[PDB]
């Protein structure tokens, strides 16, 4: 099964005659399912995603300032005004300056002064709101058919699950069926949050955090920017004029602050499809509809050999790849025991029967030696094949 390649693996073993079992699922890891007389099943959480969530807000983390205007009044003559001030697109500021005869004024004192400049966002991050209804899981699950490493990619069953679906099961040929009732209703609390999109990078962030950000912001409708005071700053006036200061691109700062968020990813195949990284899911699983397919076939021990020798997995069980070329479709036996006398099968067999289903093809097998060390068997007679293992 595809699952052999996962780094983090753990075993759930069902009680005998438990027609259901269940598993808890996480993208970093996989589960393997054992039952006393059933083909073993491996389960893995695949992509969790949304397509086209709705725009909440846009935030300009950088902007540029130009056309800067200034106007001024002598202290007695009351408050200054400007034409460009009339519209928010020019992000105005108003204040007072010294004036006096030394700057051509008629009287000494504080005089009114005003400045504007057209404001344009250079680069903006966008926010999109989580509809829990639109949460789509995908899940990967596969029986221990003993299929070749390669065939894993084609046997693998890929299923999608969502708040609109309870189970959408599948069948494994001869091995029968398992029903899968996933926890689509319950697994995450993200309704309180936005997906944050930067340039080719993205995050999930709570609505409060985002709404609390001081940078200038705009509705999902793209209405004129609301709060340029947090990006644009002004010198205290020199008597003639004010220099206007653009703060730098903030994305470095913001991307630093975002370091605590969970990451999110764009799909190239559909730019509106967003994939959540590191989610959790759980499911209830029926095992009773499973079948050990191969029981009909013979035992021949007919000069089998390794295509690839036994080796330790990433997860402490051992695996091997083998064929009976020629021979017949057959289900050769496997045991691990205390001694070459093989008195007790002291450890656990992890896939129960091979099937040499065609005279040209190989099989892949898995076993769980007992703690300490133990001896492995396949085949019969002096012509049987063997190795040694630790725990």
């Amino acid at each position, epitope marked *: 099964a595809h699952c052999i390649g996962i780094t983090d693996r753990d075993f759930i073993e069902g009680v005998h005659g438990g027609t259901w079992v269940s598993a808890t699922l996480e993208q970093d890891k996989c589960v393997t399912v054992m039952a006393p007389d059933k083909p073993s099943l491996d389960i893995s959480l695949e992509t969790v995603a949304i397509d086209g969530p709705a725009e909440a807000r846009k935030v300009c983390y950088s902007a540029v300032l130009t056309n800067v205007k200034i*106007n*001024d*009044k*002598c202290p007695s003559t009351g408050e200054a*005004h400007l034409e460009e001030e009339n519209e928010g697109d020019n992000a105005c500021k108003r204040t007072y300056s010294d*004036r006096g005869w030394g700057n*051509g*004024c008629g009287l000494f004192g504080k005089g009114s002064i005003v400045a504007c400049a057209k404001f344009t966002c250079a680069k903006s991050m966008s926010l999109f709101e989580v509809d829990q209804t639109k949460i789509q899981y995908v899940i990967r699950a596969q029986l221990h058919v003993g299929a070749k490493q390669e065939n894993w990619n084609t046997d693998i069953k890929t299923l999608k699950f969502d708040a609109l679906s309870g189970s959408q099961e599948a069948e494994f040929t001869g091995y029968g069926r398992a029903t899968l009732e996933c926890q689509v209703q319950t697994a995450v609390d993200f309704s309180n949050s936005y997906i944050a999109e930067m340039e080719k990078e993205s995050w999930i962030v709570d609505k409060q955090w985002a709404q609390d950000l001081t940078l200038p912001w705009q509705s999902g409708s793209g209405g004129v920017w609301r709060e340029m005071h947090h990006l644009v700053e002004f010198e205290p006036p020199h008597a003639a004029t004010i220099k206007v200061l653009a703060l730098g691109n903030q994305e470095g700062s913001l991307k630093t602050a975002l370091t605590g968020a969970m990451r999110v990813t764009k799909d190239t195949n559909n730019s509106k499809l967003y994939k959540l990284h590191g989610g959790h899911v759980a499911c209830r699983v029926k095992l009773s509809a499973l079948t050990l397919k191969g029981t009909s076939y013979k035992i021949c021990t007919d000069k089998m050999f390794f295509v690839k020798n036994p080796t330790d997995t990433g997860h402490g069980t051992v695996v091997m790849q083998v064929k009976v070329s020629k021979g017949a479709p057959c289900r050769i036996p496997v045991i691990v025991a205390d001694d070459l006398t093989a008195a007790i099968n002291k450890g656990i067999l992890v896939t129960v029967n091979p099937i040499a289903s065609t005279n040209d093809d190989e099989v892949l097998i898995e076993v769980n030696p007992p703690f300490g060390d133990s001896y492995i068997i396949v085949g019969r007679g002096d012509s049987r094949l063997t190795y040694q293992w630790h725990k």
Partner: antibody, heavy 120, light 107 residues
């Protein structure tokens, strides 16, 4: 009625000095900003100077120091005094008011009939 | 420094003909452009003080349109006051500056 009427243009010695003037009428002159402009004899218009409703002057680098505006809003009269005059200029001169919002950054509203410089 | 370049210089058109004239500036001007006429031998006149803005008393047959950097007049009918020199003038940036002018005539 926005009649605006320049005065004082004429002949001058190179390196000499002159004070131009203009009279406004018909509006609350203090509120507006104003500008001086010179029509070159080859017909290039060129900005000479401008003055805020706050008496804040503005000049192109080409006349920095040599030229200056001042205004007398007790009598609705504009002045433009200038020195080290050079035959780089022998234009017709005109002046104009700006916005009623009163700022240097305005288009020109209306222009006076003008008076012309010459240098020899 | 700012520079303006009006495209024509010497067009001719019939009485009541429709004509467009246009100018590109050396950078952004954010439509702080104006359009001006000199009728020959007498003091200039003001036509449009931002694109899409008729000045007072200017007849509706004058018009003009703009962008960041390139702008135009269009005249729907060159009535007999057409004859004269037309100038653009930018005023966003304090060294205010003028187009070349452009003449018009009948002969």
């Amino acid at each position: 009625e926005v009649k605006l009427v320049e005065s004082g243009g004429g002949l001058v010695k190179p390196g000499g000095s002159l004070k131009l003037s203009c009279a406004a009428s018909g509006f609350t002159f203090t509120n507006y900003a104003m500008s001086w402009v010179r029509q070159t004899p080859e017909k290039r218009l060129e900005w000479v100077a401008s003055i805020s409703s706050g008496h804040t002057p503005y000049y192109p680098d080409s006349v920095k120091g040599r030229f200056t505006i001042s205004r007398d809003n007790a009598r609705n009269i504009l002045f433009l005094q200038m020195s080290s005059l050079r035959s780089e200029d022998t234009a017709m001169y005109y002046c104009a008011r700006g916005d009623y919002y009163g700022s240097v950054y305005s288009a020109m509203d209306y222009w006076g009939q003008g008076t012309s410089l010459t240098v020899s | 420094e700012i520079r303006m370049t009006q495209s024509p210089s010497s067009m001719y058109a019939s009485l009541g003909e429709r004509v467009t004239v246009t100018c590109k500036a050396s950078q952004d001007i954010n439509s702080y452009l104006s359009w001006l006429q000199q009728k020959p031998g007498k003091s200039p006149k003001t036509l449009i003080y931002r694109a899409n803005r008729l000045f007072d008393g200017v007849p509706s047959r004058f018009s003009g349109s703009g962008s960041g950097q390139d702008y135009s007049l269009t005249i729907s009918s060159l009535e007999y006051e057409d004859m004269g020199i037309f100038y653009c003038l930018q005023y966003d940036e304090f060294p205010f500056t003028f187009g070349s002018g452009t003449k018009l005539e009948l002969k």
